[PDB]
C-alpha cells in the first residue's frame, strides 16, 4: 500500500479486529480488514501528515472500519 | 477521472464477447484481416496513456471456442501484459500506462479469478430528491439543447 | 401509507431489485376448527415464519390477553396483497406476529410505523438484510418510525445524511417490546368465540 | 348477456390478447360439512382470490344475511364456465365476493351490470390491468353499466 | 513448493467448467475449435514440468449440458 511504516496496530487491535469484524475459519476477511485500514492511512498520509508511526490501537479501530459488525459473544 | 489526469479518454464493452478470438484476432493466412479488440481501440487514441473503460464484465460466456476470461487476465495482470501479444501483429505490445476501469452490475456472473484482481466500488442507486438534482443540473439542459 | 389504526393489519417493507417497497399483511380470525391458510403467492420460508409467530404466540396467551384455546376453535387466514406478485424471504417475522396478535386480542395496531426483522421461536429478533433501500422506500412515502433488530445498527452507516435526519429508529431484541410499542392497549371489537 | 337476475351468479369481464371477453360465475350451496370445490381449471391466483372472498365473507355474516354458521353445514362448489378452457389473474374478486354472497343468502344479483377489481380481506377494492379491452367487449355484448 | 522445487507455477481454475469441451478440446472439423484448458496452461509456462494447482475440483457440476468430470479420470 505504499507506506514504508507510518502507520502501526497494536495486539489488542488485531483482536479487535479479529473478534468483531470477521467471522470464518480462514484469514481472508483479516487480510481485508487490514488492508483497508492501510488505503485509508494512505489517504490520510496525502491529505494530512505526521511523523513517526501512526500507532493505532484499539478504541481507534471503529474510525477505521465503523460500528462492529459482529459480535464474539456466542 | 480522465478529465482529472489530462488523459484521454475511450470505451470498449465486453456484453457480447462469446469467444476467445474476438479479444487477440487472426493472422495473415486468411484473406482479410480483423486484429483483436484492443489494439483495435488504440488505433483510435493517440498515446499509450488513456484510460479504457471495460463494460459489462458479468455478461459473458464461451460455447467451444475458448474462455475469454483467461485473455481478460492477460490483459489486467500488470506483468503479463506488458509481453501481451495478437494473432495479428505477432510482436509483444507495452501495456503498462494504460489504466483500465472496469464496470459491471451483478457479482455472481463475474469469473472467479477476475474477482481476486478486483476490489469492489458499490453504487447504491438514487433518492427522489437526487433524481430531481440530477435532471434540474444535467438531463433537462441536454435534451433543451438538442 | 395508512393514517388510521387498523384492526388485524401491520406495515411491513420488503427489497426488490429496484428498490424497496411496501408490504401490508392482513390477517383475519373468523371461527373455525383451528386452521392456517397462507394466500398471497407466498414462498416457503415465509410460511415457515408465519408458523414461528403462531407458534411464539400459542405459548404466552396470558401474556397478551389472547383467548385461551384458539389452536382448536379459531381459523386464520393470512393474506399478503397483492395477489399476482410472488413474495419470499424471511424478513417478516415481526410484521406477520403483530398482524397475529392485533387479530386475536381484537385491538387495532398502529399503521404508520413501518417494522422488519426475522423472529425466532423464543421470540427474538434476528437480523436482516437489504437495509437502506427499505428505509429509503420507507421514507419517500410519508413514514417517519421505524423499528429494527439491535444487530442492524452498524448498517444505518449507508444512508444519505438527509434521510435519517427525519426517521427515529427504534431497536429491538425481544417480540414483547414490539407488541407493546405497537398495539393500541384497549380492545375495540368483540371477541371471536 | 343475460337479462334475468339469477341467484348464485355474476357477470364478470376478462382478458386475452386478441380482446376482451365475458366470465359468467356459478356457484351453488348445498349442505354439507363445509368445504370449497374450484372446477373450471381455474389458475392458482384464481383459486386464492376465492378464498379470500370467502373469508371477507366469513368475518362479516351480520351485515349480509348471511347464516351464522355455513362453515361447517355448507359445502360450496364455484365454476367457471366452460371447461377445456384456461383461467386466471386477480381480476375476479368482486365477482366471487358477489357470487357467494347471492348463493347463501338467496337474494338474486342483477345480471345486466358487469364487474371487474380485486378483493383483499379487509373489503378494499384494488385495480387492474386491461381496462380497454373489458370495456369494450362488454360493450358489444349489450351491457351498459359497469 | 513451486520456489523450493524451482519450478513453474500456474493454476487452472474449475468450477465454472460444466462440459467435457474444455478439459479435453473439441475436434478440428468445427471452425474455430480449441484445444482444452491444459493445453493452454502448458503453452503459458515454456516447460515439461510446471507445477498446476487445479483450484476449486469439487464445484464441477454435473448435468443436462454435460459432464465435464469424465475426462478427468
Redesign the interface.
Known amino acids: 500500500s505504499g507506506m514504508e511504516g507510518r502507520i502501526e496496530v497494536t495486539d489488542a487491535a488485531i483482536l479487535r479486529v479479529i473478534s468483531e469484524y470477521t467471522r470464518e475459519a480462514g484469514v481472508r476477511g483479516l487480510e481485508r480488514e487490514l488492508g483497508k485500514i492501510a488505503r485509508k492511512g494512505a489517504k490520510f498520509w496525502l491529505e494530512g501528515a505526521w511523523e513517526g508511526l501512526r500507532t493505532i490501537d484499539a478504541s481507534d479501530i471503529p474510525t477505521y472500519l465503523?460500528?462492529?459488525?459482529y459480535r464474539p459473544d456466542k | 477521472i480522465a478529465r482529472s489526469m489530462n488523459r484521454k479518454f475511450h470505451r470498449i464493452s465486453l456484453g457480447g464477447v462469446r469467444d476467445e478470438a474476438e479479444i487477440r484476432g487472426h493472422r495473415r493466412t486468411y484473406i482479410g484481416a480483423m486484429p483483436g479488440k484492443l489494439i483495435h481501440a488504440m488505433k483510435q487514441v493517440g498515446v499509450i496513456n488513456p484510460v479504457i473503460l471495460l463494460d459489462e464484465i458479468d455478461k459473458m460466456s464461451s460455447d467451444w471456442r475458448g474462455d475469454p476470461a483467461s485473455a481478460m487476465l492477460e490483459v489486467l495482470d500488470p506483468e503479463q501484459n506488458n509481453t501481451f501479444t495478437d494473432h495479428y501483429l505477432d510482436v509483444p505490445y507495452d501495456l503498462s500506462k494504460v489504466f483500465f476501469i472496469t464496470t459491471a452490475n451483478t457479482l455472481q456472473t463475474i469469473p472467479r479469478p477476475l474477482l481476486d484482481r478486483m476490489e469492489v466500488i458499490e453504487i447504491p442507486g438514487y433518492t427522489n430528491m437526487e433524481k430531481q438534482a440530477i435532471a434540474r443540473q444535467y438531463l433537462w439542459p441536454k435534451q433543451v439543447r438538442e | 401509507a395508512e393514517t388510521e389504526p387498523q384492526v388485524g393489519t401491520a406495515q411491513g417493507l420488503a427489497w426488490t431489485p429496484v428498490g424497496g417497497t411496501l408490504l401490508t399483511i392482513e390477517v383475519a380470525a373468523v371461527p373455525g376448527s383451528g386452521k392456517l391458510s397462507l394466500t398471497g403467492q407466498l414462498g416457503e420460508v415465509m410460511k415457515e415464519s408465519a408458523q414461528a409467530a403462531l407458534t411464539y404466540l400459542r405459548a404466552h396467551t396470558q401474556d397478551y390477553g389472547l383467548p385461551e384455546d384458539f389452536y382448536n376453535k379459531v381459523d386464520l387466514h393470512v393474506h399478503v396483497p397483492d395477489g399476482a406478485t410472488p413474495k419470499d424471504g424471511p424478513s417478516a417475522g415481526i410484521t406477520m406476529a403483530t398482524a397475529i396478535a392485533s387479530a386475536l386480542s381484537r385491538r387495532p395496531a398502529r399503521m404508520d410505523i413501518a417494522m422488519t426483522g426475522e423472529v425466532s421461536l423464543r421470540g427474538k429478533v434476528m437480523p436482516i438484510g437489504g437495509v437502506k433501500e427499505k428505509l429509503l422506500a420507507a421514507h419517500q412515502a410519508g413514514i417517519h418510525k421505524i423499528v429494527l433488530p439491535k444487530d442492524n445498527?452498524?448498517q444505518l452507516?449507508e444512508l444519505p445524511k438527509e434521510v435519517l435526519e427525519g426517521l427515529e429508529i427504534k431497536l429491538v431484541e425481544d417480540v414483547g417490546e414490539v407488541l407493546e410499542y405497537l398495539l393500541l392497549p384497549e380492545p375495540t371489537m368483540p371477541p371471536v368465540v
Open positions: 465503523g460500528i462492529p459488525r | 445498527e452498524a452507516e
